């Protein structure tokens, strides 16, 4: 590795558990694995924290005393970065847009969003993210103008820097499965900084094994590209190469990004029934959803066992309860 | 040493590691005094909470017993009966619970969202009741239906508060005690005060681990003079239980639970908004909220024994934040 020239803060400490999936495994009749990096100890916990820890320590080496970021009502980035920013007396603004048009009481204000207030997050509402990198740019020469030093994170906060934690993530993976068969890898593939990372630290430590994306938002072909660029300048601030194609599968997120579907629901409530885990219907549980029918369609490079990377989430079940 | 007898009872692993204990220094900057916090609501189960340490033992006895149900009960939005819930659906066994309702709340994300959303996940088997008013009673006679279905059933009473479930806390001071050793010197803790057994498991603990510590229960559904007697009861059967005696004076405040089990106050309301802008740490209307209002007026008032550091035992209950919203 010798990726520790990189300052980050210490967010998690110990590595989250990687657990047997017996019930499900069972029913499936294969042997299910989990990362639980939904186990962090900052404010309901998710795969966003990894980042940050990179992230915010940038900021705070750049002396700045705000953090600004973007996403959806119920972004779990954005209300991971409000409640790393009030632990550390940072200011926090976040722009939020609605991607589904929802009217709804919880969506509107319960969740993740409700959190965002405990937080004192500074809200600003937009029509539509459609300019990420863009709109923030705005809103921080704004913020600025008011006599603040803010810092930038990017949507999901998935930059090069970001997706460091992931790196370190499969890290922590290579050696509490170091005795397990270990044939595949799956993971919700958004932003992509949690795929690219896992995908360059798994090629170095755990070059047999299959990592696959299940997009959440965008085809194979939108994203694709947005992981691959990932990867290489991950690799590249490393002093690695990544040779490594990229897997993604695209059938489990439709109708769109934030809109919960049947396979999502019920891979929910299997998880949550089988193994008294929680899944969440924007991310996990549509990821979840893809592996359930990769046994199905009998998708994967070949039979062996399968960890699920559980990136957290399930503060959005409340927003999301009882419609959107 | 004193508490080697711990071993003798067996136990499930759901936590695993020691929880964090962390240092609060925005907290402490804003109150003046050292504030450090014991993280029992980080757990790897649904959420998390002090109620999975109880389990532990209590879903054991149960295993032993060959029993394939847990039975509890709880308000519709207990964190126990989630959590117990949570644990039942990991092992396959079946979980039945009785809840009430202690508002009289006709609010749809009360009746419907947070913990009692979570329930309908785990497929708990939910059966109302008007009130607990004699819960170990209508549990048992529940137990009876259940066991003519041919189920085996463990019943788990309230907040799985039993001298064995206590034994989970009795285990967390172990932990508190190693954690401080050599890295602070507590003067208090400070622990909401409900089913009694999370204040008794401490109280026999730190009275063996950490005698001049200072060990506060914030009631959050009785008074005093209610609320000691069950505390007491608990203390003692752990202490034979454990074949030690428990000579310490049970300490309860119950300024900050008003008006009652459930209800929200303005206290607890501004403590959880204080916890949540200061340090990004999430605490709860009923239980944590209420607690930690007890630790700053105790501060503000001088109640504690002295100025030396204080340790919030966070017992969890987040998973309320969202039933209780926007109101009940």
Not at 127 to 152: C, K, N, S, W
Not at 228 to 249: C, E, K, R, V
Request: net charge negative; charged share 20%; with cysteine.
């Amino acid at each position: 590795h010798h990726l520790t020239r990189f300052p980050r803060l210490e967010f998690i400490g110990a590595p989250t558990p990687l657990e047997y999936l017996p019930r499900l495994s069972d029913y499936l009749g294969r042997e299910i694995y989990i990362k639980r990096d939904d186990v962090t100890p900052i404010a309901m916990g998710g795969n966003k924290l990894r980042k940050l820890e990179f992230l915010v320590a940038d900021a705070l080496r750049e002396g700045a005393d705000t953090l600004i970021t973007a996403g959806a009502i119920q972004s779990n980035h954005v209300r991971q970065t409000a409640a790393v920013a009030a632990k550390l007396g940072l200011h926090c603004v976040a722009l939020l847009e609605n991607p589904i048009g929802t009217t709804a009481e919880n969506y509107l204000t319960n969740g993740n969003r409700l959190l965002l207030d405990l937080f004192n997050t500074q809200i600003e509402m937009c029509d539509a993210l459609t300019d990420p990198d863009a709109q923030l740019q705005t809103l921080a020469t704004r913020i600025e103008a008011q006599g603040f030093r803010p810092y930038v994170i990017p949507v999901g906060g998935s930059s090069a820097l970001g997706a460091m934690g992931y790196v370190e993530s499969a890290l922590e993976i290579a050696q509490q499965c170091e005795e397990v068969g270990l044939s595949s890898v799956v993971v919700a593939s958004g932003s992509a900084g949690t795929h690219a990372g896992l995908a360059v630290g798994l090629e170095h430590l755990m070059p047999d094994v299959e990592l696959i994306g299940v997009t959440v938002s965008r085809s194979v072909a939108e994203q694709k590209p947005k992981v691959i660029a990932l990867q290489q300048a991950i690799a590249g601030q490393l002093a690695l190469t990544a040779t490594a194609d990229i897997h993604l599968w695209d059938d489990y997120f439709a109708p769109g990004y934030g809109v919960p579907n049947d396979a999502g629901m019920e891979a929910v409530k299997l998880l949550a029934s089988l193994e008294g885990v929680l899944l969440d219907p924007v991310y996990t549980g549509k990821a979840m959803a893809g592996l359930i029918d990769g046994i199905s369609q009998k998708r994967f490079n070949d039979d062996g066992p399968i960890l699920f990377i559980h990136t957290g989430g399930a503060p959005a079940l409340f927003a999301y309860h009882p419609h959107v």
